[PDB]
Structure 1
Amino acid sequence: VERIVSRDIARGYERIPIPCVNAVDSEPCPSNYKYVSQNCVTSPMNIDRNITHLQYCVCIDDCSSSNCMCGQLSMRCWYDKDGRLLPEFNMAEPPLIFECNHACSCWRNCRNRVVQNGLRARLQLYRTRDMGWGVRSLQDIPPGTFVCEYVGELISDSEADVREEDSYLFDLDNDGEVYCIDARFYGNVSRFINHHCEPNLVPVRVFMAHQDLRFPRIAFFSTRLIEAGEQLGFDYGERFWDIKGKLFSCRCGSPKCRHS
């Protein structure tokens, strides 16, 4: 029997609820963190929010032409009219995406606005058999769809170096002054996504309200059709596994598993 242990881990902060179920053991809904739908800070990050530092477009249409500056900053606008990545998008080595912003001349419904509209997919936190909690999709997700943002506490590399728990860390830039998102204490649904060696999600660096290149936001897009019921996964990368490989091996179960 599948016990519903929370009707919505996000407490109404997302468009739709994200329930938590457990059909495996007696663990209640995780409660040792604070759910936040948007990134936060403790110690100040001097993110450059000078509005005059934004690059922006002057389009008079819906930003579907090659003349859109924001599309040019992105190399091209990668979004179709449904907000999905074009099949040409390089999932193995994604570009930076510059969405339209409040300095642009265009309207709030232009083509180059997806991640800034937030999470839309029906997701569920659930108890896996041997990897703790995980996240699944409740409905089919077509390829190239925005699924969720990796949300947490923005911290410096120096701060990350003095934290005990590094299992909920995302590195913003792999030399010099770099930053991390730590989802341990503050995070959204993405903090529960498990690692997979052939992942159905890819992280993409995105700029929206600011273009401080030290601080990309991390948007997971589907790399293929995700069927209703499937567990979400992304590739945690080599730093994670160099460290945690000493303690445990990857249980993703892929025939192409690289960390077993």
Structure 2
Amino acid sequence: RIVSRDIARGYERIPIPCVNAVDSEPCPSNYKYVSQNCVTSITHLQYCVCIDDCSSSNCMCGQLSMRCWYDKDGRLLPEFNMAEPPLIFECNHACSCWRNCRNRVVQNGLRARLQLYRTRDMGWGVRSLQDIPPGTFVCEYVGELISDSEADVREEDSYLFDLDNKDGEVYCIDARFYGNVSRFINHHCEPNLVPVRVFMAHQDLRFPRIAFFSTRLIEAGEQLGFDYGERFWDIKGKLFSCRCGSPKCRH
């Protein structure tokens, strides 16, 4: 029937339609679509000095990533260990390389043709309208960046992605009132998307960015999903059962 032409309202390089042929509930509007994080609650050094397309072994940023994992087409190398994702550091404005060097994928926005859609049982969900090759940057988990003690007083918490730093202090990315398409991605015990911490510029290790990548071929039409984790299923895991229906589910 078609609900909305673009839930992003123009904030994405390509629109993101909403379709509901499951019931009569209208597309959501009780939140605000942002494409970049909203921050509610030293030295900017960490650059490279390349003169190439950052395709060499002398790229500091690439080295800070262990190695530049992006191939000529912005995808991860088969070498990438989707099991335990390495922190990725991309080129910024402190670097000497041009705005279009190999080491720049997440900073170039969304490229996938996505679409919000009503699920028969999970409420709202996200899916691809085109084949997405594995190890492809899909979308970032944008939202309001709140503190540890700020989330401790927010009733709704079904849109909280933690940013755990083993240094006592923890932060979160709240997507309830503000966020992007990622706030609709459902949980799956056998995830096709994997969160990868990424650093661009003006952020310390406490505040990385969450960039989702495809962990295998996500065939056109498939429903996107990532592993919410221990944290979530501990507080919600007792309000409902995991309606994933996957032959290996665990909640």
Return the TM-score normalized by structure 1.
0.94
Distance, in Å, in 2 between the alignment partners of 1:76 and 1:25 is 47
Task: Give how far 1:173 is off.
Answer: 1.1
Distance, in Å, in 2 between the alignment partners of 1:89 and 1:122 is 24
Give the 3-state SS of the residue equivalent to 1:5 in structure 2.
Answer: coil
Output one character per residue of 1:195-223: Cα deviation in whole Å (capped at 9) or x when no partner: 00010000000001224111001000000
Q: Is the 8 A contact 1:140 1:225 kept in 2?
A: yes
Task: Give how far 1:242 is off.
Answer: 1.0
Give the 3-state SS of the residue equivalent to 2:39 in structure 1.
Answer: coil
Distance, in Å, in 1 between the alignment partners of 2:5 and 2:120 is 21
Q: Is the 8 A contact 2:44 2:201 kept in 1?
A: no
Task: Give how far 1:177 is off.
Answer: 1.1
Query: Where do 5+ consecutive residues of structure 2 fail to align?
Result: none
Q: Is the 8 A contact 1:153 1:181 kept in 2?
A: yes
Equivalent position of 1:32 in the other structure: 30
Give the 3-state SS of the residue equivalent to 1:52 in structure 2.
Answer: coil
Q: Is the 8 A contact 2:37 2:144 kept in 1?
A: yes
**Identity in percent:** 100
Give the 3-state SS of the residue equivalent to 1:72 in structure 2.
Answer: helix
Q: Is the 8 A contact 1:79 1:111 kept in 2?
A: yes
Distance, in Å, in 1 between the alignment partners of 2:15 and 2:233 is 32
Distance, in Å, in 2 between the alignment partners of 1:94 and 1:14 is 26
Distance, in Å, in 1 between the alignment partners of 2:11 and 2:33 is 9
Task: Give how far 1:172 is off.
Answer: 0.8
Return the TM-score normalized by structure 2.
0.98
Distance, in Å, in 2 between the alignment partners of 1:178 and 1:25 is 39
Task: Give how far 1:24 is off.
Answer: 0.4
Give the 3-state SS of the residue equivalent to 2:43 in structure 1.
Answer: helix
- The answer on 1:235 being equivalent to 2:227 is yes
After TM superposition, list the pairs within 5 Å mapping 1:119-138 onto structure 2. 119-138=110-129
Q: Is the 8 A contact 1:136 1:230 kept in 2?
A: yes
Task: Give how far 1:258 is off.
Answer: 1.1
Q: Is the 8 A contact 2:144 2:178 kept in 1?
A: yes
Q: Structure 1 stretch 189-198 or stretch 167-176: which is displaced more?
A: 167-176
Task: Give how far 1:25 is off.
Answer: 0.2
Distance, in Å, in 2 between the alignment partners of 1:93 and 1:204 is 9
Task: Give how far 1:238 is off.
Answer: 0.4
Distance, in Å, in 2 between the alignment partners of 1:146 and 1:120 is 8
Task: Give how far 1:41 is off.
Answer: 2.1
Q: Is the 8 A contact 1:155 1:180 kept in 2?
A: yes
Q: Structure 1 stretch 171-180 or stretch 106-115: which is displaced more?
A: 171-180
Distance, in Å, in 2 between the alignment partners of 1:63 and 1:20 is 38
Distance, in Å, in 1 between the alignment partners of 2:52 and 2:44 is 23
Give the 3-state SS of the residue equivalent to 1:6 in structure 2.
Answer: coil
The correspondence for 1:109, drawn from 97, 100, 103, is 100
Q: CA RMSD in A?
A: 1.0
Paired residue total: 250
Give the 3-state SS of the residue equivalent to 1:246 in structure 2.
Answer: coil
Q: Is the 8 A contact 1:54 1:211 kept in 2?
A: no
Give the 3-state SS of the residue equivalent to 1:17 in structure 2.
Answer: coil
Task: Give how far 1:60 is off.
Answer: 1.2
Output one character per residue of 1:75-128: Cα deviation in whole Å (capped at 9) or x when no partner: 111100100000111111101100001000101110000000011100000000
